[PDB]
Amino acid sequence: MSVSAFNRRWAAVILEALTRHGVRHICIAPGSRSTPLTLAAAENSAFIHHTHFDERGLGHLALGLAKVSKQPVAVIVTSGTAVANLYPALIEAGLTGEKLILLTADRPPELIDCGANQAIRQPGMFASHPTHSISLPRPTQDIPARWLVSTIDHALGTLHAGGVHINCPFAEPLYGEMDDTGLSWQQRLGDWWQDDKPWLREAPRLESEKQRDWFFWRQKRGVVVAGRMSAEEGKKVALWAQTLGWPLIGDVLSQTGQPLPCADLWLGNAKATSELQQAQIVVQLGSSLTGKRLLQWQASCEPEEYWIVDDIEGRLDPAHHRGRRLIANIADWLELHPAEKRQPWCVEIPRLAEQAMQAVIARRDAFGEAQLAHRICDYLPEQGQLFVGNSLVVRLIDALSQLPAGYPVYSNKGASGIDGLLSTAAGVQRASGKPTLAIVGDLSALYDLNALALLRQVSAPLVLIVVNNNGGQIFSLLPTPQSERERFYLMPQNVHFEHAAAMFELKYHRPQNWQELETAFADAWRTPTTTVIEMVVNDTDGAQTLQQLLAQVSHL
Template identity: 85%
Template sequence: MSVSSFNRRWAAVILEALTRHGVRHICIAPGSRSTPLTLAAAENRAFIHHTHFDERGLGHLALGLAKASNAPVAVIVTSGTAVANLYPALIEAGLTGEKLVLLTADRPPELIDCGANQAIRQPGIFASHPSDTLSLPRPTRDIPARWLVSTVDNALSALRAGALHINCPFAEPLYGEMDDADLDWQQALGDWWRSDKPWLKTPVELSSPKQRDWFFWRQKRGVVVAGRMSAAEGKLAAEWAQTLGWPLIGDVLSQTGQPLPCADLWLGNAKATTELQEAQIVIQLGASLTGKRLLQWQASCTPEEYWLVDTQEGRLDPAHHRGRRLISNVANWLEQHPAEKRAPWATAIPGLSHQAWQLTAERSEAFGEAQLAHHIRRYLPEQGQLFVGNSLVVRLIDALSRLPAGYPVFSNRGASGIDGLISTAAGVQRANARPTLAIVGDLSALYDLNALALLRQTSAPFVLMVVNNNGGQIFSLLPTPQSERERFYLMPQNVQFEHAAAMFSLRYQRPESWAELETALNAAWSKPRTTLIEVVVNDSDGAQMLQNLLAQVSHL
């Protein structure tokens, strides 16, 4: 028996099983031990192949693909620390619900814990973070192909959200021509190879039933909190809340159009929070909230019931309200629970929101970070999408901007790390080929600089906007000790990104005015290529403007 040939046949069964569960995108890093998986993936025409030399970025590329395609995405890496580099993306997927299938090649058992090169203990390496783990045995004819395919099918059928880790040990030799010695083992699956259905179907559906007392609650004073949801759901949620006459507090990722903009400002006003105390029910559509004042109000509000609707299982309410945890697609839930036309009950909040917006607009002429956040709507590409990084800019956009209803917005707001943001944005763009504006801070860009390699070829215009405030200025919003803030928190790097763009053959612009920014963007949206636009701003101006506006709005 040719070991290399049988390894390939074993891997081919695994990869073909993935296609039966909707996996189309597969992300591959270079490696020797993963050769059986890589070659099996390369031969399978059902896959769209993506490659990257950096496994940490590769995991986030897959995460972005899964976000935008709403389908599971597979990743292939070799053994050793290559596996560990997938951890950040796996954690994020577990918190935000994207489906990843991580195929990690491994040394066979006899090479573990004996000093063999590149051999680490990989089973269980991700602890409790994957949704499920599957540690396969070394490929052998003694195990029938139907065991392998049904085992993979069973694990994939149970994957509702997060990552499935499949650890795949392979013995050497890993290279060699295919032979026919083990063809009968593979062909024992018969006409399964010519079908498009799983070998083992295990339907798993989990959804909360219609709330029979909804007709009673919809007549009460309610508040809608809109968290992360799809663009289509965001529009539906906004219309639903408007019909009910309930105030809607929209997160930057809600895509509701934020009918009451600047919520993170007006929620700091006592008149607003006093009026919100009159709410008898709060319904949160989608998890993962960004604004600090929104999170503070969410933690302190005491309605009669708090309902949280999201596709993910588990407790998603850090304030542990009394109420209902409803597992459902937001659009389906809204259809099951129609709104009844009622007059708005909150009278103070709309006025406070309007005043906060006007105050923000009056201070938005200067060329700066907070002003960019306020104006961001005018810079979005038509029929495009926005990816927002996890730095000060996401909070400024959430607090000071008003995004169009139904305009797609993506971010990594699960663990809210700065690792892999450019890679994730690249994956989002590859999944749907839309013109994409991605905004990150300078430290985030430095952290994922390797990902610029992923942007060298794009199927639609891609703008990576790096807001360079020389360090982690988000810490200026926190009570970090002034004497140690710069050295241990802000960590200014005093870098610019022109040479980074040149290293990866990307176009580069550094506008210094609104007119120059508009000129740079107009050129960038004209062709399917990547442009890195660096917006250099004064260090603490963005944080300072937000704090000043908070103080002003609190006294309205």
């Protein structure tokens, strides 16, 4: 009975069990206590392995893979604060639905709370943020392999969304040659080793029922609000709202084509709010709405019913309207609730939206971040994807641009953390294999700076644009107090990113006008590598331009 070999057999059951649920990507950080998991994973031909040294970035890389591939993605981490570093991506996964399977190696129970090295209390350490939590017991052959596979199978089979914490204790010795210890224990699973299915299949589906009065409600004056959803869903929602004759308010994340662009501007005009007051129903598809004027309009509107359709559980209306919360795949839901062609009821809003867009176009020339947001459609890679950072860039793109229907957009908009954007973008790119444009601010680029290491391995060109406005200039847009603003809010770091790019041998451009930026992009798309494009802009020009456009459009 070799402890090291049985630790290995136990782990091989866990990992092989994961392969029966769609886990193909596994992200691994270095460690000693995780050896049984890591070796089980390395010897398993089902996995694509990714490696990173920073477990917070490691968690965000897994999140980007899961976000893009829609599979569960596994993560192996050693014991101690490495486990803690998984918290941010786990939090975000719990909010937006990515299936992250966290395999956290642990010390055995005899080494907890007694001053041993790198030993901490890990069961329950993520509180209520995992969808399921499994605390595996100390490995022993007195517990049959069928229990372990069944525990794993219950956890993955019943997972509608979000992360799973699987705490895996192992006693030393961890190293040593494999002998037959644990082989007959494994062989009790019979030909399951050669199968493609779970040992225990427990796969209940969670779905709201068809709404049987939809045919009554679809004849009313409605509004469609389109939040985060897949690209194909964005197209279906566009055609659906058009057939209904209802105005479609489309988020940067919808991929609807935003037929009423610049909603964050024209929702500031009283003609629009007044016309919107006639809506008897709002059907919102998807969630995590971006614009401030749209969030305020949602919070103040009083339709007879407010419906939110999404495949993520729980309340999604922060204004708590009377209405419905419908759990469904958005495309399936539209098939169950089809549109009948009806005469459009909005007259003032389309003209207002065209005028707002025309006001933004009048201001496209200055070499600023507001204009980059407005012109961003001109730089999207062909057959590619966009990853949009948090803070001002997602706001400016939402307010000032009209992104094309069905062009894929990704984001970390569950909790809107600025802590894992580059590594998430690296997962997005690796999962799809498509050329990727990722836009972030300077504080966001500094936060996840070491994720530049990951960006040295992309399967297609990735352009990382860093808008360097010297601090978090979102706090120049909000009414922060002037005396404390720079030190306690903006926090300018007075850096450039040329040396960061050279450190990881990434191409770098710092364009000074539109022609140089166009040159930078045309060069960058030429090879499967990451290019850093730094846009240096005056600190507050973007926030001020957005405010001025808000006032201008509110007086139309």
